[PDB]
RNA sequence: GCUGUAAGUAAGCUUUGAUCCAGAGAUUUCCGAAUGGGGAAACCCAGCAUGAGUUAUGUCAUGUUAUCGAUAUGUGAAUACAUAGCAUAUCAGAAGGCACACCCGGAGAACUGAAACAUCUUAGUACCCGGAGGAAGAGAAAGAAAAUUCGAUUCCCUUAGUAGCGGCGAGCGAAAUGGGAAGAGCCCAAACCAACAAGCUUGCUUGUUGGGGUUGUAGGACACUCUAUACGGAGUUACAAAGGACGACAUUAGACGAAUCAUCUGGAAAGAUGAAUCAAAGAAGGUAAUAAUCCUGUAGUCGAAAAUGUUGUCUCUCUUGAGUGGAUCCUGAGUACGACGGAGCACGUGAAAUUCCGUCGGAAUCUGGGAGGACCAUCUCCUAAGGCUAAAUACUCUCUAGUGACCGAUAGUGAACCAGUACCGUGAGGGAAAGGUGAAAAGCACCCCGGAAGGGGAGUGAAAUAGAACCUGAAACCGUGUGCUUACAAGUAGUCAGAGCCCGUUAAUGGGUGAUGGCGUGCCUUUUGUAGAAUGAACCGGCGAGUUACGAUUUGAUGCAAGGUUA
RNA sequence: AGGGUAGCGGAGAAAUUCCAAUCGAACCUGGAGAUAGCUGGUUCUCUCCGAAAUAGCUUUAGGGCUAGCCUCAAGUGAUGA
RNA sequence: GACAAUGGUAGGAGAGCGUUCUAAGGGCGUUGAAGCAUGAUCGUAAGGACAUGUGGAGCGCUUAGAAGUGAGAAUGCCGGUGUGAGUCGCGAAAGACGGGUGAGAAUCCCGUCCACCGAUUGACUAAGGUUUCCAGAGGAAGGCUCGUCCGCUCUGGGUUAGUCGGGUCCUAAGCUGAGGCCGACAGGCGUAGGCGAUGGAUAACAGGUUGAUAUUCCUGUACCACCUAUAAUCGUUUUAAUC
RNA sequence: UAGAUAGAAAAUAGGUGCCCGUACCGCAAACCGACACAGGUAGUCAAGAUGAGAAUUCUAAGGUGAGCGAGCGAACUCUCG
RNA sequence: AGACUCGGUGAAAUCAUAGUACCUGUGAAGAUGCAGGUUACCCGCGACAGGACGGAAAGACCCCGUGGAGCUUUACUGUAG
């Protein structure tokens, strides 16, 4: 439900980090974001592409802090905890 | 975001709202009841009309073409009449399929039990056939019963394994009174009238509609008195007559949907440590390890353009309802009943009622007839010989939502995976084995030997002795090395004693080996008795055999007590 | 080569021979977990007690029933040896 | 503290251990669960703890309840592994040499010789099987050895008809069979007609050609039916030409 | 012949001509026989010398060398002289 | 030709554990496994075949079963016709 906005990945390899997302993959439920870099290899010794994680993620717009995203009233449109700006 | 499982590549689509979800609609090749003919199922061959293309034939497109019946036609003649037949047209008719379930009907067995068996039982079960339903059957008293009588049917309890049937053996087995679930009663036939009809006896009667009328405490007709009036009404489309309008509710896609931060460990926290929060939501599952406060979610609330289903009110239809009197008529005929053979009723021919079947005989008409377990009498009750009928009930191929002191890959569906498959058989038919990498594919770049395969290295990853025949990885079985020991030796193979050599524990009367001596004929089963040359086991792993309901009986406990107890 | 007859049956130059490698009555499914007085098998330890192989009847003698002989819990109460 | 008993099958009575699950309570667990393995330990027994290694996520304990509750033996079912055994066999048969290939050849290709069948181990078709056919690669298993090869795998590719066998022609045996006769239902019989060839009738030959097709392709030469176009014969639509 | 129907077409030119099957083995390695199995598997052609002859012996056409072999040359079994 | 040695490939019915003598005796009354004596260094390979009451086939003979089928008849009871 996300198309390249901000997040804070909290509960994975290394946390406290943020970044912006690529394909959400609705079926596998796995998003692509800067924060994991597999050492893939083809015939280079390594490749350093970008890999995915399950949704252990959260958004942050006004508080500059993770909150439970909360799609609220119809004006649909997002309406977060403390502040209500677009997703 | 998408182009299924099923990767991958390339081409492309998508806020001008894809894909996806739900409802309607359009298409829906061929076989198959198969239906134009034929046919080895999925092929072939035609016909007629119309219409494509040819100069023209060949060739094609669409439509149409079976049988049966049941209506309307014409036509029919072996015989003149006119029927049998014949050609044509109409029908949303039927045929078939199935859920091996539940129901009714036709037909209908044997092993077995009886300690054998023929009566009998199993059983009126199985399978077969047929029909219909979503439920069926039954059904509104020619009952039950014996009183302060009740007044369709069905099912559950109970009466009762009682009364009874029975080579009186096996065994079989009610019904009623009573307590409950559901509760519903109605139309014909007939005598009477009108109409039309052939015989018109110019007598009226039969033939067809409409009325008319539906019963035991007798009723209707017929005669008479009032109600109603084309309606005051009851209507009730689930019987009772068969048609149609218009609101509410549920279903088939969905949405909202409160709440948490940090330190340590970690590859990774959802854990420990602390301090905080929501609760109509601490159900559940997933999330790199065990989460109410990360996601999906739940409590609760909202929501349907269209379609369906059930319900409601006006339309809608359709309808007279009682009473008396009973002069005269009517109350279901080759029926009821009897005998003869049989079946079925719990009931085997028994004294055997009551009900059905076949042959044959053969009643009555309300001052009538049937029953009340042979049969007659009195008494009591009911009125066949015509028909319809919801619910209560039985089952679940299937769907929705749920659940389990149910299984967790030799269990459980046979089937967790590409299974009614491979396979076997001519064929009916029978029938397999086979789950798991990791959190994520990050699925081993690169070097080296090698023809390859395979491997050693290097790297991804916490771990690759997790590397695809990939979690864990036992035992059999096979090896490699090694401490001790073994080449004059008669061995169910061990045990007891014990020197020598070596080693040091879940640290105690230690452990490994064992020159030599004493002693000693496996295990179960079955047996008068077995080393047994009587049987079975090749080894090891798994699997695998006194269970459950109902009832009787006793034992122990427990509660009550001349009372106790519920279905 | 194409066809027929099908098991309470058929066909048989007849032997109880053939009927999809089987025939003193084929084959598959269902009744059906048929029946068996017969054989075989019956899973984890200890403690206490402890037999019989006889009588009778049995279309019975390798089975059964009753009495004997055992065990357990009550009762009797010195009756037993 | 004394006294006495304590072998034991069928079998009777009694007390007991552990597994799976449930309920409740209380606890353990990445600072490594379960299981597994090793061990010189506890208990009278069935059995249970402990330490260590491997293992990588759930488990114990007390009380009680319900059980698909225990397996050495069924000529038991299934699975795996041996024993026999590197033992019998390797499925009639005459091959040898050279040269190539290849990582590697008694077995593969090439040739020369030799031997064998020859009313045939030859050539052609039917039934039958279903792509085995041909080319190019490959050798994991199959081939009763080896294999650089195949009828095995992978990729690609191959079957041409107016005259041929057959259908649009016929029919027996037999099968089906409108109406119809019969039967408890099912269904059984059977006329009309219809299907059904191994038979009857039916218009074609020779050569060439591909790694793989041949009366099918081309090359030449022929035939039957049919339509269209064209004319030398007909003359009531009779009869005559004519169907 | 009943019947159709105005009234042909000699030989000429031109064209039109459907479905199935067709590969391969087919006394075999490919069919039935569970096997790349010493079995069966209808039919057609079937040459040469010798011979009555499709018999027999040896050869054409053409096809094959049989899917384990090398040693030694004992028992024993089998096949032949 | 097989067997036999070497190379290649590589099964099976069976199988309680085994380091598996003989005699005379005992014994379920015919012993590798017991008692008493006797002889025998450990391990092979090729041959024979007395024993392993050897294997294979839950004895085809005999008997039992209140087992079963087929068949006969002036056995019973019934029946189609
Ligand atoms: Mg219809
Ligand atoms: Mg009678
Ligand atoms: Mg009668
Ligand atoms: Mg398992
Ligand atoms: Mg035992
Ligand atoms: Mg004896
Ligand atoms: Mg004969
Ligand atoms: Mg049985
Ligand atoms: Mg007794
Ligand atoms: Mg075992
Ligand atoms: Mg050579
Ligand atoms: Mg063919
Ligand atoms: Mg052959
Ligand atoms: Mg000759
Ligand atoms: Mg050898
Ligand atoms: O059985
Ligand atoms: O059985
Ligand atoms: O049985």
Swiss-Prot record:
Protein family per UniProt: Belongs to the universal ribosomal protein uL24 family.
Entry keyword annotation includes rRNA-binding: yes
NCBIfam families named in the record: rplX_bact
Gene Ontology annotations for the cellular component aspect, listed alphabetically: cytosolic large ribosomal subunit
Alphabetical UniProt keywords: Ribonucleoprotein, Ribosomal protein, RNA-binding, rRNA-binding
GO MF, one annotated term: structural constituent of ribosome
Role description: One of two assembly initiator proteins, it binds directly to the 5'-end of the 23S rRNA, where it nucleates assembly of the 50S subunit.
Lineage of origin: Bacteria, Bacillati, Bacillota, Bacilli, Bacillales
InterPro entries: KOW, Rib_uL2_dom2, Ribosomal_uL24, Ribosomal_uL24_CS, Ribosomal_uL24_KOW, Translation_prot_SH3-like_sf
Subunit structure, interactors included: Part of the 50S ribosomal subunit.
Biological-process GO terms, alphabetical: translation
Annotated HAMAP family: Ribosomal_uL24_B
Biological source species: Staphylococcus aureus (strain NCTC 8325 / PS 47)
Domain of life of the source: Bacteria
The protein's name in its UniProt record: Large ribosomal subunit protein uL24
């Amino acid at each position: 439900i996300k198309k390249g906005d901000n997040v804070k990945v909290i509960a994975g390899k290394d946390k406290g980090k943020e970044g912006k997302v690529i394909a959400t993959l609705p079926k596998k439920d796995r998003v692509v974001v800067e924060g994991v870099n597999i050492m893939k290899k083809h015939q280079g010794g390594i490749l350093e592409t970008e890999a995915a994680i399950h949704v252990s993620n959260v958004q942050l717009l006004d508080p500059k802090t993770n909150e439970p995203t909360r799609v609220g009233y119809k004006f649909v449109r997002i309406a977060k905890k403390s502040g209500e700006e677009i997703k």
